Symmetry: C4
Subunit: 395 residues, 4 copies
């Protein structure tokens, strides 16, 4: 009576029926029922029930039954213990805080990480290795995107933008850069039309940020061509705004870098560390405010109440400029454009540097470990390709 | 004789009675008593005592009995082993140093982390979500605190503080900033009176730093209003001191940020890493002193004993200024306002930079791991809300 | 029927024959064959098969058989579990991603880390301790390499390179430096000839980068001596190019430092962290481009469309210069030669500093842990010299 | 025959006699002897030998016997496994490299961390809490050491060192600083004589660096007093040298800080990380040399062979100055006194910054983990005071 022997994989586990009955509604409680002999795998010769499971972790499940707190064995994986808990009927949300992080770790990382020739036309954007012409198409896209970025950067330069005499010496960009941009634009509009020919799930295609960027980058050239026909002052202002807008041409490099695994892992880490990024932002804002105020007040210790020369011997004429000084000092950047020149200001600056180091190194390690785990998991996915299951399940 | 079998959860542990008698006053010693058969769960058919506990950790407790040193199994938690030690009667303070840190880790983290409508009136400060008007009240407090901080920072500026001609061109702050501050102050005094209406445990309410800050921030406006009535030079000096005191208005943001979990975790980490902060302070002070002296003496190698031009070609006219140079160089800030200009001074500066890196990276990682553990524990508290126990203890 | 008992090192493991038959072609499946009694170690008295292996890990192998996913026990080593898997016939490539990194860790680190007197002549380069004259030879090589590097650095100086009056005041290097270089060169050519005397595997000897460097460093002196005979303008240009080429003399220090274990470990880490170095390069390039464009556009907010004074109050005259500013700001270097001077530019600079910190601290920790593991393994190789096996294997 | 059952703590371990005989000279081999029944604890009823030890680790020792490689269980401590190996006769130096670091970790940390009233006189230096007058004596030493350091730093200042008119306006230090130094010196010489009164083990007392520092700091005042009597030019030169020597007064603070546990741990870490410090030094030297040469040659790309204006537009007039630039850039200090001004020089500077970050972060983490382990161990020594053994060993 009250003595029940559970044989888990050849290991005899002995406990009381009241111990099993403690947790109701589970398989071991059903074992603690007067019909378990007729409801389970029981042999009368040994008076023991046989379960074909892992005894090393069944020890810990029975220890949960005994004590009342569910822990996870540190000598097996979270997934292994989770499968055993699922079989034995235990809720995985009963696990103690001392086990929760190491238990829900691989699962959290995995959840963070995760018309005849119309397919032939849609293969234009597809993996360059997945076809023969796709390789050349992708290489041409690489070359044209790089050339467009280079032409943009050269357009911002001064050697290619001279001041020719005109209605005064107005500075105009050399026209060969515009011709190169025109060639790039005709290629890019060919590619965009070829990809728009095949647009399954047009809602998702429009919602796609990469194609949004491509259209936004292709608009300004045509808007400029149309604008130049009309010679008005408002046309000139819109032309200048279009020149500002042309910065979207450098965003086309994310199309090229989208396939890099480290970039995808970084995106996953950014999406999963929102709380830590907010923590860093709040720490920086509080430190910047406090240290800007402190340096403003410390750089005029002993100054007269209304002497205009109070702010004449300092870089800290106000608190908003101390904001910039404080961020530069806390990041250990130290440009040197503004620094304290008084003993109290130097004390405050030393405090600011140390506090910046500490409150930068608080959440950055959390984000770093998140990235490390996600990168390792993705790399394992790359090192271990899916293969034959090799395991034939029992019917 | 002398052979005793302990059956712990179906696992037969065999040891000598003298081995059990080694540690007196404990449950296993009582088992090694001639009456254990009449004092414990003993069956004569098998000549074994049955205990319904964890055998994997009972192995380690018996190993303590055998060898004489108590260790902790690395395949279970500190709390699990602590519960087993509490049941078996072993003192948790006998654990070896090789186990103490990993054993007393979750426990240390947990100890670091932890009149009809008078409640309706006291709900004014309560959680904004805990009521309907509290949401609007908290949003108004947010807006007014931010506006007061903005008005303070603008008051320190020069665009809003012109030099109008008066008894000379005295610089006076624009009065619209003072009017905005007055509106903020009337709102804040309404809030303070409404919270003072309900003040249970007035000793604790006075001791509360947040309300102390609120009163200290609300005093200066009224003190200024009263002071302006009396036109005296001492009144002007007290007015200037009140202008200095007005910096307490930026401390009201801690009322808003008090509810952030990362801020509470940071406070816990600061309170728990006092020794490491003192270690960092001592390291920095020793390095600053040594390197200031070394750079002072190295920047005049070969100089004449009393030539006044000895200090003319150097930024290091003395040692106290080398203190500032040394802290800036050791934090890898590098403002550049003062640097060595001699070969020996550059050697000393390289030494200073490397030593600063090392003696900054010594205790900062300890503080960082403390923060990481506390943050993870608090986050687990947030991921796993308290629910039904699900465990019905035996009577 | 269907009940089979496996005795692994005195521990009875019980499972179903269908469970063993799940994974075909392995030793346990052969055990689940009607002839296992005649094909294995079986005794009819106990109806159990005996295997003389580790039961604690056999539990996990049988758990793989039971559930269908292969994991690794966290309480043993990867090599231990690998040997057990090799014995039991399980493929090591079936291990789950949650186990792959901690399993294939030591193995990955190990794979990263790994004519009468003609031998007497070839002993000239050999380990200095491996002979008597080799010690003096290696010390002489040390002294001469250091002297050559010192003479190079002094040659670049201005105190040793005066402007003597000649066909004008042409600046010529003092001839005593050239004489010292000549002595060093005659020693080095003696050493090179002595090592070329014994050149086993001449293909590998030529492919050896150290000897390539030695020959490239010894060529310029003789090329200069031959060139000075011919007095032509093209001869002067080739002489200047040879002066540029003389920088290869500082590369001879890698011959001296080749034997340092930390340098070999660093080479292994560089070879094994190519993916992480590419990740760092891509992150830096993307950040530099984005932040250079952003600072260029933010430093002229509100500027006129074609006012030439738009770029007059800024260090950021174009985007390529912003590349340099961005790298300096992201590395937290902060030279201060160019910084933002506008509120929007300061916002962008704060963003740049924080983003640089984060995207520098993402892959650098991965590289750091790689180096740490490899260094620890190499140091263990140094702490535990190979000794007698002490284990006599059974025939 | 050939079948032997070992009963280790109630757990039956079964193996072959040849398996035990594999490792000769050990206790299990002696068990595999025809007399083991008469040489060990054997009962004929069960045909098993009983050992009262830990079965979980005996499994791993027997696995060493079986396979031939000795590993350490990850679910127990190094000290626990070491005690078991010592009992079973296995050499601890047979452990595999995959186990050596985690096994020899606590032991390595522990080895790194470790005439009537003549005792009354010698109590003058003793722990201030260990007596009543010692508290006041130590506080007086604190005050006098701090005052001496302050007087030194003030002596280096210019406000306290005016140029009074004398044989010209020679700058002489104010005499009140010298009087304060004289008071400090008389106190310190009293303390030194009182400590020299009781000098057990005079060889060790002389070898003690703290007392060496105290004597060296007390000499210069008396040497100055004696020197001032003789008015000679050589006397003035020796006086100036004594002024230089007076820097030893700041070294007296190590007497005060010697008792801090973090300082003792830092000393242990410095003594135990000599290899890593040499690694850091070699990495820095190689990087500094390479990048100084590279920046020197990159800052004059396209310059004429002998144009004196080649070095006129650069901070890098030679390679030795590039050494300083390179160290400043690699430490991410960035003073800004010298920076590249050419596109190639900026490329080289970006390379230098990244390489400096990487080769600083390579061995610094190793040193940091060493310090962390030693600090944790020392802190455990402080958290767990030695108490009653509580364990009565068997005779
Ligand atoms: C043990 C030693 C105890 C200290 C003994 C000496 C303390 C008193 C020194 C005498 C100070 C004095 O009488 O005159 C005040 C001077 C004025 O110097 P100043 O206000 O800084 O202006 C000139 C600075 N320029 C612009 C040239 C860069 O002030 C100065 O010369 C510069 C201020 C030096 C003190 C503050 C430096 C920053 C402290 C950082 C170190 C703390 C790190 C701990 C962590
Ligand atoms: C292998 C190579 C072995 C070294 C061979 C060359 C060593 C001797 C070079 C000749 C030095 C000489 O004769 O003249 C002394 C010059 C004087 O230069 P200065 O005292 O620094 O003043 C000018 C500096 N301004 C102000 C322009 C910035 O000094 C100088 O030009 C600058 C000093 C250069 C040496 C110190 C630089 C800092 C050392 C950091 C590198 C160590 C890092 C290891 C970790
Ligand atoms: C809570 C506080 C809320 C903020 C309340 C105040 C905000 C408005 C302040 C008034 C600004 C104004 O009206 O004038 C604009 C001025 C012009 O100043 P400027 O454009 O920078 O030019 C002078 C700077 N020199 C060259 C001398 C270095 O701008 C300035 O004075 C300097 C710009 C200050 C703001 C940007 C500083 C950089 C922000 C870093 C902090 C963010 C960190 C979060 C992480
Ligand atoms: C995708 C984009 C591809 C790049 C397209 C543009 C590349 C070509 C730009 C045109 C360059 C040119 O024609 O003129 C050369 C100029 C001369 O400028 P300078 O030699 O540096 O002198 C002036 C600099 N002051 C002293 C004012 C600071 O050079 C310059 O303006 C400054 C040099 C800019 C390039 C080097 C900057 C440093 C590179 C760091 C970024 C790499 C980080 C990767 C990790
Ligand atoms: C400081 C430097 C390193 C830039 C800042 C890094 C991140 C803020 C950005 C830059 C590049 C971005 C990546 C560029 C491209 C992609 C592909 C993108 O996938 C697609 O859009 C594919 C088509 C689709 O399904 O929409 C997913 C996000 C990701 C990884 C981005 C995630 C966010 C990243 C890492
Ligand atoms: C460099 C920047 C990040 C500022 C420095 C950070 C810490 C020095 C300070 C700033 C904000 C502080 C927090 C602001 C508000 C609170 C709420 C406070 O709780 C209350 O006062 C609630 C009412 C009460 O019971 O008293 C407890 C401390 C804490 C977490 C503070 C702990 C110490 C913190 C983290
Ligand atoms: C920033 C500083 C630290 C320099 C950058 C470090 C690495 C980029 C370089 C510098 C020195 C190099 C090492 C110098 C010498 C050798 C010996 C070399 O071995 C031989 O060539 C021996 C003969 C042969 O078999 O070829 C193997 C590479 C290694 C470790 C090199 C690996 C790459 C290292 C670490
Ligand atoms: C950059 C700053 C942090 C200074 C550099 C730190 C270390 C290079 C030095 C500074 C203070 C030194 C400590 C000062 C005093 C002592 C006490 C000393 O003990 C005694 O001399 C006691 C009497 C004796 O038995 O000799 C042992 C070394 C230690 C810990 C020293 C170890 C080396 C330390 C940590
Ligand atoms: C027009 C008044 C002018 N005169 C003067 O002596 N002061 C002053 C007075 C007291 C003070 O106190 C400090 C000191 C240091 C810190 C960090 C601090 O943080 C807010 C406050 N700071 C300046 C003036 O501003
Ligand atoms: C008025 C004397 C004037 N003349 C002179 O030659 N010196 C001098 C002498 C010796 C010295 O030694 C050093 C060198 C380097 C360091 C780091 C050091 O640390 C304390 C001490 N330093 C300077 C003078 O100060
Ligand atoms: C000749 C036109 C001249 N006038 C003007 O007002 N601008 C301008 C307009 C809008 C803008 O928008 C921003 C603002 C910030 C950032 C970071 C940004 O990133 C690309 C873009 N930046 C500048 C001019 O350049
Ligand atoms: C008096 C000759 C003068 N003229 C000239 O054009 N040069 C030159 C030639 C080639 C070169 O090559 C490089 C480039 C970059 C690096 C990093 C490098 O590392 C050693 C070498 N560097 C300079 C001169 O010095
Ligand atoms: K840093
Ligand atoms: K810096
Ligand atoms: K800097
Ligand atoms: K700087
Ligand atoms: K830095
Ligand atoms: Zn737990
Ligand atoms: Zn232990
Ligand atoms: Zn697993
Ligand atoms: Zn191992």
């Amino acid at each position: 009576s009250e003595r029940i022997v559970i044989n888990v994989g050849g290991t005899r586990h002995q406990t009381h029926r009241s111990t099993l009955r403690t947790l109701p509604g589970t398989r071991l409680a059903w074992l603690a029922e007067p019909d378990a002999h007729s409801h389970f795998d029981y042999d009368p010769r040994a008076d023991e029930f046989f379960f074909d499971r892992h005894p090393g972790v069944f020890a810990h499940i029975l220890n949960y039954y005994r004590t009342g707190k569910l822990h996870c064995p540190a000598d097996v994986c979270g997934p292994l213990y989770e499968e055993e808990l699922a079989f034995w009927g235990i809720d995985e949300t009963d696990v103690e805080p001392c086990c929760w992080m190491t238990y829900r770790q691989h699962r959290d990382a995995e959840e963070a990480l995760d018309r005849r020739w119309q397919p032939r036309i849609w293969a234009l954007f597809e993996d360059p290795y997945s076809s023969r012409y796709a390789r050349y198409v992708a290489f041409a896209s690489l070359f044209f995107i790089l050339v467009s970025i280079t032409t943009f950067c050269l357009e911002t330069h001064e050697r290619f933008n001279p001041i020719v005499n005109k209605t005064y010496r107005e500075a105009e960009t050399e026209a060969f850069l515009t011709y190169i941009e025109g060639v790039c634009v005709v290629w890019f509009t060919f590619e965009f039309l070829m990809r728009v020919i095949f647009c399954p799930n047009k809602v998702e295609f429009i919602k796609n940020s990469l194609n949004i960027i491509d259209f936004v980058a292709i608009l300004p050239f045509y808007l400029e061509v149309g604008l130049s026909g009309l010679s008005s002052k408002a046309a000139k202002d819109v032309l200048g705004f279009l020149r500002v807008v042309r910065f979207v041409r450098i965003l086309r490099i994310f199309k090229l870098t989208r396939h890099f695994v480290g970039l995808r892992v970084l995106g996953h880490t950014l999406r999963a560390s929102t709380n830590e990024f907010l923590l860093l932002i709040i720490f920086l804002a509080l430190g910047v405010l406090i240290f800007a105020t402190m340096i403003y007040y410390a750089e005029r210790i002993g100054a007269q109440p209304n002497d205009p020369s109070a702010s004449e011997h300092t870089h800290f004429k106000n608190i908003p400029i101390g904001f910039w000084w404080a961020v530069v000092t806390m990041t250990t950047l130290g440009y040197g454009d503004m620094y304290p020149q008084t003993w109290s200001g130097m004390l405050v600056g030393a405090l600011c540097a140390l506090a910046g180091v500490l409150t930068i190194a608080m959440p950055v390690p959390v984000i770093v470990n998140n990235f490390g785990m996600y990168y390792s998991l993705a790399m394992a996915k790359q090192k271990l390709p899916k293969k034959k299951k090799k395991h034939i399940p029992r019917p």
